[PDB]
A and B are shown apart, each in its own frame.
Chain A
Amino acid sequence: SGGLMEQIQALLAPPKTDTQHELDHNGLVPLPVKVCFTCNRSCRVAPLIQCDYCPLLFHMDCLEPPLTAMPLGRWMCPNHIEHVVLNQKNMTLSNRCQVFDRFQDTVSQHVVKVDFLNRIHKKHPP
């Protein structure tokens, strides 16, 4: 580790006279596989990023617009609804969360949602 810096600074001195969707440890595509939502390909082509709200894996290039770097924090996939809620940026996250939880207790609602769909679907309004 012989560097010349000490000798130069002495020579010039003044005369101061004072998890599952990743490659294995050895490196292998885990099986069974989970694929990107846009291309249906695994982590072998490119690393996959996992949305932390829904189980949808994505590729950094398969997005629109593509991500330039890895998202360090919690990332939101483009397949959710809070994006249209983000159109109005004045309101804080607590009101948004309470609005979402207004529909978080009857999550199925399948009969009523198909019913509302056909109710709107009628071309001539009632």
Chain B
Amino acid sequence: GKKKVCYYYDGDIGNYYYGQGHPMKPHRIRMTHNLLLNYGLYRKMEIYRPHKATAEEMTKYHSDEYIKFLRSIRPDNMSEYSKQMQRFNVGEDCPVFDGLFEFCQLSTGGSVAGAVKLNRQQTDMAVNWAGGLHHAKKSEASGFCYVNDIVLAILELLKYHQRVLYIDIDIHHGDGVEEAFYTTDRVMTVSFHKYGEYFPGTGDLRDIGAGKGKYYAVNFPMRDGIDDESYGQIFKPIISKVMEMYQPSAVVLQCGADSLSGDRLGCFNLTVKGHAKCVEVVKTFNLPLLMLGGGGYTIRNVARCWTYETAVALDCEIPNELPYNDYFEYFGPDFKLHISPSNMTNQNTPEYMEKIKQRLFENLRMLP
């Protein structure tokens, strides 16, 4: 039925500048919000301003030294932290820009507030598109991410929920979140990703966990050019089996949009409808769900995808015609909500997918 979905947005998130020519652009969130305003989706949704997360809420997973470095480093004093900058992997790939700590605070606070809201049972759906940074490690920055807010949100969720299930449909492997919970059975991480000469270079079929957390981490490696039909054919049965064996109490869904066709860094061939089919499938199971952002580097497609999933979570149907908005010219020349795929070859043959699915099923049957 129709339920309540808390929405977290801070007006200042769109202004933070990663640098010239850097693929990561917070501006996308702003455009997404703008689209939500011009479809009239603010009336059926509750919008909150996320509180900034103190360093004390970040040091629950990150070391105090790394957080102190993040809070201290500025573009005008890069000379006095060079060694530290080498140590914490802050530099070329993850640059130091103006107000990066405030960006991390807002992104983390949105997801932490959503997790607290879900714990208090004031809602069964919280959305934070500023979140979804899953590559950050305990004491280092990786993959354009500085603070791992997914781990902090799950740590907040664990205070009331015995089992938390995390699902990752970003094209990259969520190594930070999987590594944070590699040896525990209270969190199982499902990741669908491209594998083979690709960042971060982890997430093999045989990475199934360690110690007490064995068989509680599943990875589906893929090839170039997966499309909507294959993704739908292999996502629904695997998630159904995971939910029937694991029986979780809360779900955290990472909705990274770099797995769509035409992405500046991705290789897949999904569309907005096929991407949001996963949201529909997850929502079918009626669990406290926390939807997060993530990757996505073709800015217009990110806006389209995230506004469509926000509409889907509200059980609202929106027209295929884009309404007039502040960033309308981004969406030319068609000005449609849905996107068309390319005709790139799908290298994932049916036998490959069947074999990987069978291996995953046999791995899942071993849970107690």
User: Which residues does A use to contact B, with CB under 8 Å?
Assistant: 46, 61, 64-66, 68-70, 72
Contacts and interface: CB of A to CB of B under 8 A. Distances in A.
B355 interface: yes
Contacts of B352: 61, 66, 68
Contacts of A69: 195-197, 223
A68 B359 contact: no
A70 B349 contact: no
B205 A65 contact: yes
B221 interface: yes
Nearest to B355: A66
B222 interface: yes
Interface string B322-364: 0000000000000000000000000001011001100100000
Interface in B214-243: 221-223
Nearest to A64: B355
Contact of B351 (A61, A70, A72): A61
Contacts, number: 27
Interface of B: 195-197, 205, 221-223, 349, 351-352, 355-356, 359
Contacts of A64: 355
10 A-B pairs closest in CB distance: A69-B196, A68-B221, A68-B195, A66-B352, A61-B351, A68-B196, A66-B355, A61-B352, A65-B359, A61-B349
B234 to A, nearest CB: 14
B282 to A, nearest CB: 25
11 contacts: A46-B349, A61-B355, A64-B355, A66-B356, A68-B196, A68-B221, A69-B195, A69-B196, A69-B223, A70-B196, A72-B197
Contacts of B205: 65, 68
A68 B173 CA distance: 14
Interface of A is mostly: loop
Contacts of B197: 69, 72
Nearest to B206: A65
Nearest to B222: A68
Nearest to B359: A65
A68 B353 CA distance: 10
Contacts of B351: 61, 66
B35 to A, nearest CB: 25
Contacts of A72: 197
Contacts of A46: 349
B227 to A, nearest CB: 17
B311 to A, nearest CB: 34
A64 B195 CA distance: 17
Nearest to A45: B349
A64 B206 CA distance: 12
B223 A68 contact: yes
Contacts of A65: 205, 355-356, 359
Contacts of A61: 349, 351-352, 355
B362 to A, nearest CB: 11
Nearest to A69: B196
A46 B350 CA distance: 13
A69 B222 CA distance: 9
Contacts of A66: 351-352, 355-356
A52 B223 CA distance: 25
Contacts of B355: 61, 64-66
Contacts of A70: 196
A9 to B, nearest CB: 8
B364 to A, nearest CB: 15
Contacts of B196: 68-70
A47 to B, nearest CB: 11
Contacts of B223: 68-69
B352 to A, nearest CB: 5
A86 to B, nearest CB: 13
Contacts of A68: 195-196, 205, 221-223, 352
A64 B356 CA distance: 9
A46 B349 CA distance: 11
B206 to A, nearest CB: 8
